[PDB]
Amino acid sequence: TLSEAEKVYIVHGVQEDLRVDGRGCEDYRCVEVETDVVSNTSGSARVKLGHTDILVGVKAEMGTPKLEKPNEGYLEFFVDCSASATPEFEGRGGDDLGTEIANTLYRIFNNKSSVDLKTLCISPREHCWVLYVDVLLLECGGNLFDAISIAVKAALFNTRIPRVRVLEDEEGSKDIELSDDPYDCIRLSVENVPCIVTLCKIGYRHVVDATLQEEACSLASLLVSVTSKGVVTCMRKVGKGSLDPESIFEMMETGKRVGKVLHASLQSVVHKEESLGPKRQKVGFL
C-alpha cells in the first residue's frame, strides 16, 4: 500500500509519459531469462523480471488419456505461491492466487491450436503423455502473469519428452520400449504458445508491466493472451474498478504489438542459448 499524494504523483507522471524508473508507458524492463535450471525435470525455466523471480518445472509423465479426448494428452498446472514471496502467504493464504493463476493458465490452453497434443499420444484410450507444469513463486514485484507465461513458454521450448513404444500383447501383458538415446528425445512446437500481457489503466492512460506501486494506483487491468501471429486467445479483466468500452480497443491493440515484440525477443534469445551449449555453465542462484 501507499498514500494518496504518491498516487497523484504517479498518475500525473503517467499522464506526462514518465515514471519513477524514467520509462514510458509501453516499455517493459530487462527480464533475465534462463532455461535448464533444474535437472530432474523433463523441462525447466526461470525468469527474473525486475523484482519478481519465477521458477517453472515441467514433467512429462505417462497416464491414461481423457475419455472425451483419447486421441491426445493434456497439460496440468500447479502453482506453489511460496510464502517466500510475501509473508502474508501461508499454507492457506496462497491458495487463492494459485488457483487464480492456474485457472488462467488453463484458459490459455483450451485452444487446441497451441500445443499439438496429438503428438503426445502413444496408444489411444490406453496410454498417453501428460505435462505436469509446476510454477513456483519466489518474489512478487508485479507484472506477475506475463513472467509466468514467459516461463511456461521457455520451459515448453526446453521440454524433452522421450520416445516410447507401448506394445500390446495378449493375456493382458503390456511392455514399454524406450529409446536409449537421450539425444533422440522429441520436442513440442511453441510457435503458438501465447504470452500474457497486463495493461493496467492509470488515470486516462494505459500501462504495461504495472509495478506494484502503480497497481495500487490503478482501477482496472486487462489481461490479453497473444500468439506470435497476432490473434488473441484470452481476454480477461481484473480489478475492483470500472472500465470504459473504447479504451478496451486501445488496450487490445497495444497488447498485440507488445506480444509481437516479446515473442520475437524470446525466440531469438532461446535460439541463441540452445546454440551455445553446455559452455554456458548454467549460472543459477549463484
Binding site: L67, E68, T99, E100, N103, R107, N110, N111, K112, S113, G230, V231, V232, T233, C234, M235, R236, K237, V238, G239, K240, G241, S242, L243, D244, P245, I248, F249, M252, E253, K256
Partner: protein, 252 residues
Amino acid sequence: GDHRRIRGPEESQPPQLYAADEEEAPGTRDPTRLRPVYARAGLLSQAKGSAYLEAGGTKVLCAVSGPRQAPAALRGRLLCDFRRAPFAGRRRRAPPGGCEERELALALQEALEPAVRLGRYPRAQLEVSALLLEDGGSALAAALTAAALALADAGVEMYDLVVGCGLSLAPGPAPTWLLDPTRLEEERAAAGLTVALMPVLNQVAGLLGSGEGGLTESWAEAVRLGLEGCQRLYPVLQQSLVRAARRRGAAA
C-alpha cells in the same frame, strides 16, 4: 472419503460417454436474438434481498445476507459464493468444486465491486450467494444480473445496475458471433465471451473470454454486440424491480 457426507461409491461415470450417436446440432438462427427472460425480485423470504432469473434452460437464484460486522480501510466488502447445483449439466460434480466455481466467483466480485458503493457500508461484509439450478447457456451473465437484482432489492446503494451477456463463435467457415447461446451452441463452439456493464454511465464492470482462436477485430465486434444486447435487456430488470417495490407497498 468425506466424513461430512453420505458414504457413496468411489467413482461414478455417466452413461452419455457410453452412448453411440452424433448429437443434434442447432443449425441456423437470427444471430442478434435474445432468449425470453423471466426476472423477478423478492422471491425468498428469510433473506434481506433475493432475485431469480430464468432464460431458456438457465435458472439462477441469488440471495444477499446483508451487512454483518467483520476512508480506504474502513471500506465495505462483499464476498460472493457462486455454486452450481450438482444436478445441473450433463455431468455431476460433488458440491465442493474448486476449479471453476471460484473463478466465476472472482468474476462476480470484480463485476459487482464497481457498481456497489462501499463507502456507505464500512466495517461490513455483504454475503452474496448465487445458485445455478440449471445450466442452459450464458451462466455467469445470468449470475451477475441476478446478484445485481438481489442487491438493488435488499436496498444496498449503488451507482447503476449490472447487465451481463454471453457470446459464442460459430466454428463454420464464415464464423459469426452468436448472441445469448445455448449449452449446445456453447459446447460446439470455438470461442466464448462474457460482457457485463452499467448501461447508464456506459462502463464495463467485468468481462471475460476464451478462444480456440480469434483476432482483434472479431473480439471487438463481439464486445460491442454484447453491449447492445445488455442495453436491450436492461428494461426487463427495471420493470421487475418496480414490480417488487409495488408488491412491498401493497403488503403495507
